[PDB]
Amino acid sequence: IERLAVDESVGRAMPPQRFIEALSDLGVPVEFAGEDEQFGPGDAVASFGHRDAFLDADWVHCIRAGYDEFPVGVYEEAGTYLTNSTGIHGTTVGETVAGYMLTFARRLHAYRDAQHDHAWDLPRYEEPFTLAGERVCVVGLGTLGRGVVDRAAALGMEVVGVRRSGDPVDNVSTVYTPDRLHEAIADARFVVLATPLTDETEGMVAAPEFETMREDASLVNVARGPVVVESDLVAALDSGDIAGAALDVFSEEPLPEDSPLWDFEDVLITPHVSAATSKYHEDVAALIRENIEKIATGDELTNRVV
Amino acid sequence: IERLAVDESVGRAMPPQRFIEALSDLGVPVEFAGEDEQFGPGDAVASFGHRDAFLDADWVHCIRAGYDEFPVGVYEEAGTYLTNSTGIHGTTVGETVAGYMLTFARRLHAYRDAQHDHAWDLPRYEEPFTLAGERVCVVGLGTLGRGVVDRAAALGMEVVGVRRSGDPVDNVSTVYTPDRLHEAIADARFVVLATPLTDETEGMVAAPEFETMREDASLVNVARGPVVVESDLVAALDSGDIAGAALDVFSEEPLPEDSPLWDFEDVLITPHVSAATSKYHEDVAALIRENIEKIATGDELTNRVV
Ligand SMILES: NC(=O)c1ccc[n+]([C@@H]2O[C@H](COP(=O)([O-])OP(=O)(O)OC[C@H]3O[C@@H](n4cnc5c(N)ncnc54)[C@H](O)[C@@H]3O)[C@@H](O)[C@H]2O)c1
Ligand SMILES: NC(=O)c1ccc[n+]([C@@H]2O[C@H](COP(=O)([O-])OP(=O)(O)OC[C@H]3O[C@@H](n4cnc5c(N)ncnc54)[C@H](O)[C@@H]3O)[C@@H](O)[C@H]2O)c1
Ligand SMILES: [Mg+2]
Ligand SMILES: [Mg+2]
Ligand SMILES: [Mg+2]
Ligand SMILES: [Mg+2]
Ligand SMILES: [Mg+2]
Ligand SMILES: [Mg+2]
Ligand SMILES: [Mg+2]
Ligand SMILES: [Mg+2]
Ligand SMILES: [Mg+2]
Ligand SMILES: [Mg+2]
Ligand SMILES: [Mg+2]
Ligand SMILES: [Mg+2]
Ligand SMILES: [Mg+2]
C-alpha cells in the first residue's frame, strides 16, 4: 500500500480532516478523496459507502461494522480486499443499550416528557424497577452483543443469548442456537438485537416473536432495521403484545416523520447514533494502523469480508 | 412492642395496604394510623415524617433514609427510639445515577426531545462520549454513594470521592477529605452528591464549587436539595460555569412549576424517585422485621438515630 485515500463519505460519521490528522504518522500519506476520484495499484481507500471507482484499488476499508450495502461478490472478482470496522463499537453501543434499559427501568424518559410540561408527575407504584435480577436476551454475541452482555452482567442482570454455534459465551448464563430463539426470548424483560443483516436474519423478529415475548418486555434494536418487521412492531406496540422498544436503526433512515413509532411513550427513537463517539476517528484509525502493519508483514488482514 | 402502627404518610412512598400486607406475621398486630391517632406504651410507628403524637410511642421507624425533618433532640427527651431506612436504596439510586450519566454521555435526553418533534436531529460530533475513561467524583460514600461508585467503576469510569475520614473505599481510586472538595471535583466529568442534609452539608455546593467544576461537567443531586445553593446552581447553568445537572431533590418539593431548572436542556429533573421501586414495601418491611428482633433480644437497633 502506497497511499490511503479518505473518501468524503466518511463525513457521514466523522469530520474527514480529524480522521486524516489522526493518521499523520501512519507511514504512508493520507489524502482526502472527493466522490469523482480514480484509483489504482497501491491505493487503499477508507469509505462509508461503496463506489465502483474503488474496484481499481488494492484495498477498501469500510468505516462501519455492517457491510450489507457492499457488493461483496464484485470485490471478490475484481481482486480488491474489503475490510469492515467490526470490533470498535462494543463500548459505545454497550453503554447506549445500558442507557436504554436503565431509562426504561428507572422511567427516565417519562420524567423527561413531564419536564417539558413542568409537571411533577409520579410514576405508578408498579412501574419503576431495577435491572438487577431482571433477564436480558442478547441475540448476536459478537462485538455489540458482548458489549451489551458485559454491562448487563455487571449491573446484576441475568443474561441469556443467541449465537450461531450455541456455544458458551463469557458472562452469558445460557446460550441458545438461533432455532431456539423463542425459548431464549420468552422469559426476558429485554430482547436486544445485535446481529448483522443477512439472508437468515432479515425479518427475524416479527408478530410471532412479539406474541412470545412478555407483555412487560421491551425490544432493543441496534443492529439493522430489517431484522425486525417494522409494521409488526407497530402492531405489537398498539396491541400491548410487548411494552416498548428502544430503536436506533430502521427499515428507512431517516425514520419518516409519518412513522407511528415516534409517538409511542415507551418507544425510544435514536437516529442511528448508538455507536456515536467524539473519538470515532481514533477508533477507526487504530484499525487502519493494524491492517497497514499486517500488509507490511504479509499477514492476513483483520476484518476481511472478501 | 405490642403493635406496629403504619402512619398514613407512608402513602407518600408506597400504597399503605401493600406495606401492611408485607408486615403480616410480625408477632404483633399491624394497624393503619391516621393523622389524629394517639399512641402509647408498646407502640411502634412506621412513618414518612414526624408527628408530635409519636413521642408517646416506644419507637418510630422512618421509612426514608433521610431523617433531617425529624426533631431528633425531642425524641431523646421523650425516650422514643428513632430509626431510619438507610441501607436499602443503593441499587435503585445507583441504577438511576448510572442512567443519568449514560443519558448525558449518550445524549439520550436530546434524542427524546427530538422524538416529540419527529425530528431526526444528529448530535454535533463532539457531543457523544463514553463513560468508560471519564471521571466521577462521589461526595458521601455511604449506601447511595457506594451504589453509585460500584456501577461507575463497573462501567469503566475513574472514580474519586469525598468522605470525612478519607479512609479508602472499594472501587474509589482516591478519597479526599471535605476540605479538599475543590481538588476532588476539579477534574470530574460528573459530581454526585450522596450526603445527608446536616448543618455541615447544607449549602456545600455553591458558586465557588461551580466555578471550580469543569465547564463540560454535570452535577448529580440525589441527596437533598439544600446541599446545593439552588440560586447559585441556576446562575452557574445560565452562565455555563457547568454544563448541566441531574436533579432528583430540591429545596422545595414538588419543584415549583416556575423554577428556572425545568427549562435547561442539559438538566434532568426527576420527582424524588431515584430510589423508586415496586418492591419498596418488602425492602422496608425487612428492616422493620430486623429491628423488631433487635428490640425483642435487647440488641442495638439498626440505623438508630436517637
Ligand atoms: N447501530 C449502530 O450504529 C451499529 C454499529 C455497529 C454495528 N451495527 C450493526 O450490528 C451488526 C453486528 O455488529 P458487530 O460488530 O457486533 O458484528 P460481529 O460480527 O462482531 O458480531 C455479530 C455476531 O452475530 C452472529 N450472528 C450471525 N447470524 C446470527 C443469527 N442468525 N443469530 C444469532 N447470531 C448471529 C455472528 O456470528 C457474530 O458473532 C453489524 O453487522 C451492523 O449491522 C450497528
Ligand atoms: N433521592 C432519594 O430518593 C434518596 C433516597 C435515599 C437517600 N437519600 C438521601 O441521601 C442521604 C444519604 O443516604 P444513604 O442511605 O447513603 O446514607 P448513609 O448513612 O448510608 O451514608 C451517608 C454518607 O455520608 C457521609 N457523610 C455524612 N456527613 C458527611 C459530611 N459532612 N461530609 C462527607 N460525608 C458525609 C456518612 O458518613 C455516610 O458515609 C440521605 O440522608 C437522604 O438525604 C435520597
Ligand atoms: Mg403512565
Ligand atoms: Mg430487579
Ligand atoms: Mg419467526
Ligand atoms: Mg407478547
Ligand atoms: Mg404499556
Ligand atoms: Mg444541541
Ligand atoms: Mg470515554
Ligand atoms: Mg456496602
Ligand atoms: Mg465551598
Ligand atoms: Mg466551572
Ligand atoms: Mg437547594
Ligand atoms: Mg456550556
Ligand atoms: Mg420549559
Numbering used by the authors:
A (entry chain B), B (entry chain A): 3 to 308
Q: What's the paper's own text on this?
A:
Sequence analysis has identified D2HDH as a member of the DDH clade of the D-isomer specific 2-hydroxyacid dehydrogenase enzyme family (2HADH), which has potential applications in the synthesis of chiral fine chemicals including alcohols, and hydroxy or amino acids from ketones or ketoacids. Structural studies have shown that all members of this family share a common fold based on two domains, which cycle between open and closed conformational states that serve to close the inter-domain cleft, bringing the substrates together during catalysis. The D2HDH dimer has an overall ellipsoidal appearance in which each monomer is folded into two domains (d1; residues 1–92 and 283–308 and d2; residues 93–282).
Interestingly, the structures of the D2HDH complexes determined in this study have shown that, dependent upon the crystallisation conditions used, the 2-ketoacid substrate can be trapped in the crystal structure in two different orientations, representing a catalytic or abortive mode of binding. In both the productive and abortive modes of substrate binding the 2-ketohexanoic acid alkyl side chain occupies a similar position in the active site, but is twisted as a result of a 120° rotation to the C2-C3 torsion angle. In this structure the ketoacid was also bound in the abortive orientation, showing that the difference was independent of the nature of the co-factor.
